[PDB]
Each structure stands twice: as C-alpha cells, then as structure tokens.
Design a protein around this ligand. Structure first.
Ligand SMILES: O=C(O)[C@@H](CO)OP(=O)(O)O
Ligand SMILES: [Mg+2]
Ligand SMILES: [Mg+2]
Ligand SMILES: [Mg+2]
Lengths: 431, 430
C-alpha cells in the first residue's frame, strides 16, 4: 500500500514553478514532475500571486495534493497497479470536467507517480506497465524522434508565420543511429544559421532550436535542406512542421495572415493556405504537418484531409480530448493525435485518447510541452503506447534530451525485444 | 560487492555525446553522467574523444565507454574494494590509468566510475550522497546549503554575440533560505529576459549554453546596467549581489601580453585590473572568476594584493592540487572553482577542496557548459559545506535539475540545514 504522498514545487525549463509528486511504497520512492505549456484544455491551477513568481506559483496545487488528494487516496487503499481505478478516484475527488477544482497539474502528478509505483510493484519498467494498460502488442516499437531544429512564428523576429520545423530521421536502422543522424544534422544547421544570419542566430529557444530572422517558409525549409545535405543524409531524413495556425487565424473573416503588420489582400483563405501546404509537400520531403488549420476550423481540416496522403497531426484541434477526437474522426479532419498528457489530466484518459485514435488508424505522436523538466515519463509513454512517434524538442537542452537518453537506455535494455519504427511510424501500433 | 559496471553513450545539453556509467550493488543501480566543458583550460585532465570525423563530428566517446566496459569495469570488480572507501577506489582507478593527466583510459571514463561508485557507497551507508561526501571531506554539521550563483546573462564562448566576458551572475545571499533565494533569482531572470527583448529585440530573448539571455551588447557596463535594472524591477536591490566569470584565457593574446575585449585596442593586465576596480566600486560585484590568464601568475598576484572581494580561479587552478599549491604560495587567488571533470576523480576533487580550505579559500562547486540531467554536484556542494554553487541560470533543465535537487535536500534536512547567505566565502567554518 501507499505509505506517503507528498508534493513540492520545482522549476521547469523556463524557470517557472511546477508540481512534483512523491509516492512511497515498499518498493521505494516514485517521483513524477508535471509539464506546462505556454482551448478546451485541462485547467491547471496557478496561485495568481503577482508578487511571487509573477503569479505562476503552484503552492495551491501542491497543497491540494498534500492535504486533500494524498490522504484521501491512502484511505481509499486502491491497488497501485490498477491505474484505471486510481485515476477514476482522482476524477471523483475533483468532480469537474476540466479539473478546475483540484487542478490538472495536481491530479496528473499523483497519476503519473502512482503509475510508476504500479510498475515497480510489478517488477517491470514503466513502459512495460503502460503496454499492459494500453494493450499494445510485443515486441516494443521505439519511436522516431521528431526533432525541432528551427522556430518561427511568435517565437522569432522575421515574418515567418510557421512555428516549428522538425527533422524526421525515419530511414535509420536503429533509434540509436537516428539520434546520431539528427544530432549531426542539428550541428550543421546551427553553423549554417550562424554563417547566414549572424552569430546570435545560434542561440536556442525554449525547445532547443534556433530562430533567426526568416521571412518565408521555403527560406526555413531551404536552410534545413542545406543542413541535411552537408551531413550527408539527404533522402534518409524527412521534414515535419507544426504550423500552430491558431496564432494567426482571424476568426472574424475566416482568413489566415502570413504576417500577423500585414496587408488585407494576401490574407489566405483555407483553400489558399492548403495550396501552399500542397506546394511545399510536393517540393520538400514533408511527411507530417501539425495544426495546419485553426483549432475550431473543422471545415478546413476536412478539406485538407481529403487530398493529403501525408500525416495531418491535431494538437490544439484535439487537445488530447476524446470528445474532440471523436468529432475529428466523424468529420475526417485529421489522421494523427499529438498526445499531451497534461492536456487531459490523467494517464488513463491519456491512454484512452490514444486508443480512440488507434481505432481510426491514426498515428499517435507523444509530445512534450514548451515548459519541460528533467522528468522522462513521456519516453516510457511513447514506448508503452507502441506509438512509433515522439516529439520532445531539439537534440539540445537537457529537458529535451533526457527523454531521448531514456529511450537509449530502453533500446539497450530491450535489445532484440524492441524494433525501431522506421518509415512505418504512422502505423507503428500494428507494425 | 559490485555485481555489474556498465557504461553507455548519452547526449549532453549541447547535443554532444558523453559518458554515463551504471554501478549495481545489493542496494540497486547507481548512475552518473560525466559533464563536458567548452571553455576548457590547457591543464585540465585529458578528455578522451573518438576523433572519427564521420561520427558526431569527431566527438564520440565510444572508446571511453569501451574503456569502462572492457578495462576499468572488470578490473575494479576483481579487486573487490569496499564501495564506501572512495579513496581506495579512486587510487585504484589512477593505478590502472597510470598517467598524470588521465590520458590513457580517459578522464571521462574514470570520472563516471568514480561518481557512480560514490553513489553506491552512500547507499550502502543508508545515507544520501551529500552525507557520504561530508564524511569523506570531514566537514562538520549542520549542513550548509549553497548560494546559487546564477549566470543570467551569457557571453563569451557560451553564446553568440559581441560580449567578451563569459558569465554575468546574480548572487542572492541576503535571502533567509535557499528556497527564497531561488525564487528571487527566478523573478529577476524573468525581469531580465523581458528587458533584454524590449531593449535589444526579440532575438535577445534567446538563451546561451547555460540558460542566460544573450543580447548583442559590447561592454560589460551594458550587461551590468541590464542586470541592475532587472534587480530593481524585481524589488531586490541591495539584497542580490553580482558575480562575474571573465574567462579571460579565451582572449589573452599571450604573445603581446594583452587581452582582447573583442576577440570574436587590447589591454595590459594593469589596464584590465583598472577596469575591474572601476566596475567593483560602481556595481555590487562580490566575486570575479578568472580575471587573468591561466598562466599569467604575475597579474593574479598584482590583483590579489589590492582586492577585498572574491577572486576565483578556474582555468588557473583546474581543480588541480598542484596548481592550487602554486596559487596559495604566490597569493594569486582566494577561491577555487571546483570542477570534478577537470581532475578526473572524486577523491582528487575533494582533496582539491580541502587544500583550498587550508588557506581559508572559498570553494564554488561548478557545472560545465555542457551539462546533463545528472545532479551529482548538488550533493557535492552540500557535502563539501562550500556554501556556493555555480550551476547556470534558472533556465534549461540541465541547470535547474541541480537547483531542484538542492530544494529536495533543503526540505529533507529542515532545521538540520542552514543557508550560507552572506557567509558564502567562509561557509565551511560557518
Ligand atoms: O568556465 C566555466 O566556469 C564553465 C562553467 O560556467 O564553463 P566551461 O565548462 O565551458 O569551462
Ligand atoms: Mg503544436
Ligand atoms: Mg501553441
Ligand atoms: Mg569559468
């Protein structure tokens, strides 16, 4: 049984507080940290004291764990291996749809730490425990890393509207080789950004990529193309994009602004914006595009889904919510889910969201948040869900690479009992 | 005894491979990762790299990893040394390498085993690593939590720009606790980053290798004014001090005996000493690291004689007891920057700290510019009773993981620990 549940405040990769939860059983201490992003999302609880951390404190969510959730869960005396019963009891304590009573960050912290307690009691690592929960088959599939190497949009100075530009090393024979290839391409890109845009262009962003003053999407894609050629991996490494188009969708006119100080004549309809995506995908090896249209522009998604053979990933459209996923399935809006566990609040609901996506032959890309920690839970999640896709930043900044290092340890531990997803990442759950 | 010693390759916070070692005993697995520096000194321990320019640009550590798995691992297991006797372990590791600079088997191969065995030794004792280190170092109780020297504005070889000086740090020593000092630094950092964007564009908000903001500024007076304004906006003026790591070995043209403040009109060491004295009388600068070159011993002594603030040796002393002895005898500095991977073992790192304490030096346990999720130096700083740690800005988790670990140590110890505060230069005898 659980002997102690204790939470505390730690700092994330941006320097903001977040929740860390300890769960102690006979097998030892089991610790998890909650991420944080920068929507119909799960309501995370912030203190709001503008004299402490700029109002970003989480003392209230920590207190809810220590004073309310903890003692109630210990008295309930649920088997730590039964994640469904644990998370059901956590949502019963909260009692709200968006987890606004106790806080999504407080609930998830207990949920993930109890999951590691359940894994430790079974004598298996977390990814094996999650595979039992999700019912994924063996051998384990190691995910292809979608490594963000260049950033635009609201996180850059140029007119580039797209947010994230990633490299996809899917042709590598192993996850270990896919990491070295991505690492080498990233070094060639950082040196290119320095030589082409100045020494300051090498300073990284929140996720570890560069963000120089770039004006067009092809200018960013050309720079990535040049970095892949220098490393000698042309044709073996693909490209992914996270447009984050909710940042520049003017809902009043149903038009998209590619310079969100702009002109009113170049504002793209979703038919015009899709033509630019189709043109880029016919020129560059773009195999995955995330959030190409706004979070509530369902008609645009379905229009784009009908003609596209590449992966169409929902993030702000789906917010890891099975209700939004069911609607996206019924309207044929996307074919992949970006899984952010803190967008829904519990591991069980996160697994259910992945299962609902698999039922429509979707891909699942387990993702990080822009504010990450040294916690590596999502590395075991991507392996346990047999997702074949993980998105956890550049090969830079350790809140990003600690996830990749963990998969290296999982890769070495499993050996023959694990296969790399490869080019079959969109269907890895049935690989 | 030891049942398994295994090493693998992992990536550091810059994307370069480094060495991670596992040591398994009856108490379980014990793991440590070796850091890696960018502004390395010439006298540091030899870091073994593969040199295969087709793999990681020649920065692989497959040979250092192999040296642990095929040479060091089997040799230490057969010797059957008590995991608590760190001295005999580190003495045995140096016997296998047999070289002074740890060239042979690789200092990154030796350090990984040394730090992992240390965590295994602590677990057999049933105590945390900082307690086991306090036993090895002979430091008294209660435990002293370190003042976090947070490099909030990066420069030099740590960030792209025109700023010559490497590190500009804030020193929250007036705070009543480590936890409050960490909140103060996080609040000042948020005021600084917003101020850097407003004053120098959104590009100035991007960070360097150690998490600090990198505005494209020229002089150190600009950086100090920016930090000063951020401290005032946060409301902690007079409670937070300022420290600098010049890393002047990076721009010391040794031929003309001059320092290039634009190495990306050079000064002598007298002219550079006048600049330091003018900045220290203008800003609350309480500690300056590497103000002169790693072998410019005359300049260090010339500057030490007239300065009451902390003068920290880094590339001058490279955590080497032989270099520390010279600096003591020549009166070159009054503080040591302790980097474990500069010397190669934990015992030699501890001995370097004790030799500094004998001359009433301060000791600042430091990270490297390329760090990992490893948090060993947090327990090292608390175990050595150093009262001051340098582990980066409150940004990028390879920096904060050490800070988060000290928060857990703070909560674990309660009243059995005290924050070093303003006594960080003399915290060992606090
Ligand atoms: O110079 C230093 O003090 C260290 C830590 O800041 O940097 P590097 O590891 O690059 O030597
Ligand atoms: Mg997105
Ligand atoms: Mg967004
Ligand atoms: Mg230094």
């Amino acid at each position: 049984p659980i002997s102690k549940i204790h939470a505390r405040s730690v700092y994330d990769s941006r320097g903001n507080p977040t929740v860390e939860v300890d769960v102690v059983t006979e097998t030892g201490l089991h610790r998890a940290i909650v991420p944080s992003g920068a929507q119909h999302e799960a309501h995370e609880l912030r203190d709001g004291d503008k004299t402490q951390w700029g109002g970003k404190g989480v003392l209230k969510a920590v207190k809810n764990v220590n004073e309310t959730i903890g003692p109630a869960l210990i008295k309930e005396n649920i088997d730590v291996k039964d994640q469904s019963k644990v998370d059901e009891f956590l949502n019963k304590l909260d009692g709200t749809a968006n987890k606004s009573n106790l806080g999504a960050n407080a609930i998830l912290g207990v949920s993930l730490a109890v999951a590691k307690a359940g894994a430790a009691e079974k004598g298996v690592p977390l990814y094996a425990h999650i595979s039992d929960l999700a019912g994924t088959k063996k051998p384990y599939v190691l995910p292809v890393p979608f490594q963000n190497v260049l950033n635009g949009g609201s996180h850059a100075g140029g007119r580039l509207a797209f947010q994230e530009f990633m490299i996809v090393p899917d042709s590598a024979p192993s996850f270990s080789e896919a990491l070295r290839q991505g690492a080498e391409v990233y070094q060639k890109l950082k040196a290119l950004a320095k030589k082409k845009y100045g020494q300051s262009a090498g300073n990284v962003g929140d996720e570890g990529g560069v963000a120089p003053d770039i004006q067009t999407a092809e200018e960013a894609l050309d720079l990535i193309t040049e970095a892949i050629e220098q490393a000698g991996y042309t044709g073996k490494i693909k490209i992914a994009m996270d447009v984050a188009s909710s940042e520049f969708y003017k809902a009043d006119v149903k038009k998209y602004d590619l310079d969100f100080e702009s002109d009113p004549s170049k504002w793209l309809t979703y038919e015009q914006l899709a033509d630019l995506y189709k043109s880029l995908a016919a020129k560059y090896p773009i195999v995955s595009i995330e959030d190409p249209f706004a979070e509530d522009d369902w008609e645009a998604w379905s229009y784009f889904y009908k003609t596209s053979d590449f992966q169409i990933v929902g993030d702000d459209l789906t917010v890891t919510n099975p209700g939004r996923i069911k609607k996206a399935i019924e309207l044929k809006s996307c074919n992949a889910l970006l899984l952010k566990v803190n967008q829904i609040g519990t591991l069980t609901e996160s697994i259910q969201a992945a299962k609902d996506s698999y039922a429509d032959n979707w891909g699942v890309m387990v993702s990080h948040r822009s504010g990450e920690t040294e916690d590596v839970t999502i590395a075991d999640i991507a392996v346990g869900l047999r997702s074949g896709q993980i998105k956890t930043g550049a090969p830079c900044r350790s809140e990003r690479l600690a996830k990749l290092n963990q998969i290296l340890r999982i890769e070495e531990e499993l050996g023959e009992n694990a296969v790399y997803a490869g080019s079959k990442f969109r269907t890895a759950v049935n690989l």
